[PDB]
Every structure is written in structure tokens, then in C-alpha cells.
Design a protein around this ligand. Structure first.
Ligand SMILES: [Zn+2]
Length: 210
């Protein structure tokens, strides 16, 4: 449904979560991004960006897709474990998500397996991502693998098990602390996209990361 066979469509999450609107309504601050002409949005601070899961993924996520985002974090945020994006059930339990694990300087892709357990693909050794500068991370979710790209460089590919159904009675939310779904973490957001083409990250360039 979200991604029909056939180029393949993509979804602008900054648009869907109405981040731009919130900035145009003085809810959050807009700042210069990774490059002079780029606009970024400052987050965290107790703005709640969440959308009922049923409103976006009534049938869950497709088998294959890619998640791409350009963001910046600094100070205390660098040591926190937080989900830049995730789908959680009504109680706040993660169904699928992309976690920036500052405690181990790694990025973790979590997903529900066929038996309902939460499986993970942990990409470690990513110290370069925690330097307070702008970075772009992309994850290509394929049939049996998940591949991480950082600043347009292929970093590593890990095997992943078949995805099971997810609970859709919750919400898709942005920048929430890994342990507490009610706590937002401050960070700057410049781009966030979910694309139907799992190989979408391969044709991305990073000229905007001076
Ligand atoms: Zn539930």
C-alpha cells in the first residue's frame, strides 16, 4: 500500500510532521543549517511531534524501504540514547526505529521479528558521528539486510530477520529518549525522508555538508 510496484515514491517527514508549520507558527526556532542557504529546525524542548500510526501506516511498513535524515546534535545530547524516528505502540514500546546510541557511539535499527520480539541491527564504531557537526545518516532496509550510510559513505551492512507485524495502535514520533517516550531530546533537523526505494541512499550526494 505505502509502496506499490511500478519512479518509486518518497515521503517528506518534515512535511508530514508539520515541523515547518510549527516553525512558521513560532512553535520552534528555524536556524541556518549545514550550509548557508539551508534551513534547519531546532528540536526537542518540549514540542511533541507525533502522528497516529494508523494515519500513516495502517498496514505497517513495507518489506523494503530506506530512511534518510540530516541532523545535528551537540553537548549533553551526544551521550544520550535517543530515537530520531520510531513507531511505538500505545504504551510507548518500540515497534520499528532508528536509534542514535550515544552511550556506545552507534546507530541501531530495531524492528519486530516474526515472533513479536524486538530485533536489532547495531552499527557500532561511529565516533565520527558525535563531533557536533552536521551529518547525514541513511539506512537501506532490504529483504534480508540493513545497510548504513554516513555522510554519503557506505559504512556497513548487517543481516536482518524477516519483519513481523507491528502494533499500529500507537504513534510515529520524533526525537524521543530511548528509555522514556515522554521525553524529547534537543537536536537540529534539516531533512528526513522515507523512500520506497531501498537503494535510494546510493544515489545521494553530500555537497551540503561543508
Ligand atoms: Zn498495543
Amino acid at each position: 500500500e505505502l509502496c506499490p510496484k511500478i519512479d518509486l515514491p518518497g515521503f517528506d517527514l518534515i512535511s508530514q510532521f508539520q515541523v515547518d508549520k510549527a516553525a512558521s507558527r513560532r512553535a520552534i526556532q528555524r536556524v541556518v543549517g549545514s550550509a548557508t542557504l539551508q534551513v534547519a529546525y531546532k528540536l526537542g524542548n518540549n514540542v511533541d511531534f507525533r502522528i497516529p500510526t494508523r494515519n500513516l501506516y495502517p498496514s505497517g511498513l513495507p518489506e523494503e524501504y530506506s530512511f534518510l535524515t540530516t541532523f545535528r546534535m551537540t553537548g549533553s545530547t551526544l551521550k544520550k540514547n535517543w530515537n530520531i524516528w520510531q513507531i511505538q505502540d500505545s504504551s510507548g514500546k518500540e515497534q520499528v526505529g532508528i536509534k542514535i546510541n550515544g552511550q556506545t557511539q552507534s546507530v541501531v535499527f530495531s524492528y519486530k521479528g516474526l515472533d513479536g520480539s524486538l530485533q536489532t541491527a547495531a552499527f557500532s564504531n561511529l565516533s565520527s558521528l558525535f563531533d557536533s557537526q552536521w551529518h547525514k545518516i541513511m539506512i537501506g532496509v532490504e529483504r534480508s539486510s540493513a545497510t548504513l550510510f554516513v555522510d554519503c559513505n557506505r559504512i556497513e551492512s548487517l543481516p536482518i530477520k524477516p519483519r513481523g507485524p507491528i502494533d499500529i495502535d500507537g504513534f510515529a514520533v520524533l526525537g524521543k529518549l530511548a528509555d522514556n517516550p515522554q521525553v524529547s531530546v534537543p537536536f537540529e533537523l534539516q531533512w528526513m525522508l522515507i523512500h520506497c526505494d531501498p537503494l535510494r541512499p546510493r544515489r545521494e550526494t553530500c555537497h551540503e555538508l561543508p
